[PDB]
Each structure stands twice: as structure tokens, then as C-alpha cells.
């Protein structure tokens, strides 16, 4: 079977576990949890096939740096998650980027950027510019509305056919 494995990267403030657990058991939690290091896997029918995806949540902080540079050489599917509402999220991709494009030693990479809090009142970031900046890098946007539970699963499958032309 062919298992994907992706990182869950993102800031405090963002929706992290709200992703994870809204598409793995179909919850929505309310609560925050300043999460560390867990395995979360759930097996996903596309195109007919049936893959395993392995998604590891780790830390929304700049806190394990080194660690931050050793599972960024594996970048088969990057989740840019930043939070509609939170500007400095959003501006916070290039610095990740300037770092990304170093430990992957590749100008091409398969990205997938989703704005989430797109269901709530308080925006800041625009959908044109938001597109804007994401253009720029080359990466596609995506809107993820966690509380509604909308996108959400639609948005998983867009990286994975990015994926899926990255290899022929
Ligand atoms: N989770 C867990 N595991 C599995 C894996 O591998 N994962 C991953 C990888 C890479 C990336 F990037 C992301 C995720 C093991 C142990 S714990």
C-alpha cells in the first residue's frame, strides 16, 4: 500500500489538531492544546485507491530548530497552514520558505497553501492576497474552513495530486 508521509507545520493560533481531528474522527475541537509529538494516520481512498496517510504534529514554535532542519528533508508534502485573521502567520511563510528551499535543496516543491478561520468574521488577509504572495512562491491557495468543516477534506486531495504529478 502507498503511505504518504507529511508534517503538520503551522503557528500557535493557527488550527493545527483543528484540521487533524476534523478530518480523522470528524471533531471539532474548541479547546487549544500546545501539542509536541504524535503519529496521526488514517487511510484515504483516491482515484480508486486506497493509501495510508502518516501525519506528524509537531510543535507550532521555533523552538526545536535543529529538529525543525531534520524532518524538512522530507519534503514530499508541505501543509502551509496560516490563519486568515493573524497577518504575522501569513508573512511568517517566507521565513519558512528561505529555510525550506535549503534542507530540500530544491527550487520545486509541491505546496499547498490553506487559510484557515475563513468561516470566521474577523479577516485580514484577502483571498486576492493571499493568492498574491502564494503565486509569487508558485504554490496554489486553498480555503479551509475548520469550524464548518468546509474544504477541508476537498483540500487534502488537491496536495495529493500534486504528489501524485511531482512523481510522473
Ligand atoms: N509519525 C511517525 N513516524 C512516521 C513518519 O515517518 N512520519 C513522518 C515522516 C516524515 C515526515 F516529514 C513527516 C511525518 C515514525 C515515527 S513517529
Known amino acids: 500500500m502507498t503511505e504518504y508521509k507529511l508534517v503538520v507545520v503551522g503557528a ?3 488550527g493545527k489538531s483543528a484540521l487533524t481531528i476534523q478530518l ?14 504524535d503519529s496521526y494516520r488514517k487511510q484515504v481512498v483516491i482515484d480508486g485507491e486506497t ?6 504534529d509537531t510543535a507550532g514554535q521555533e523552538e526545536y530548530s535543529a529538529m525543525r532542519d531534520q524532518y ?4 514530499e508534502g508541505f501543509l502551509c497552514v496560516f490563519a486568515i485573521n493573524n497577518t504575522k502567520s501569513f508573512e511568517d511563510i517566507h521565513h ?8 530540500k535543496d ?6 499547498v497553501l490553506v487559510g484557515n478561520k475563513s468561516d470566521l468574521p474577523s479577516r485580514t488577509v484577502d483571498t486576492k492576497q ?22 477541508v477534506d476537498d483540500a487534502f486531495y488537491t496536495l495529493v495530486r500534486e504528489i501524485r504529478k511531482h512523481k510522473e
Open 72 to 75: 524538512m528533508r522530507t519534503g
Open 12 to 14: 500557535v493560533g493557527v
Open 51 to 56: 493509501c495510508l496517510l502518516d501525519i506528524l
Open 24 to 37: 480523522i474522527q470528524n471533531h471539532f475541537v474548541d479547546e487549544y492544546d500546545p501539542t509536541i509529538e
Open 106 to 111: 530544491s527550487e520545486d516543491v509541491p505546496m
Open 96 to 103: 519558512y520558505r528561505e529555510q525550506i528551499k535549503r534542507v
Open 130 to 151: 493571499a493568492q498574491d504572495l502564494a503565486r509569487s512562491y508558485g504554490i496554489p491557495f486553498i480555503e479551509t474552513s475548520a469550524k464548518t468543516r468546509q474544504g
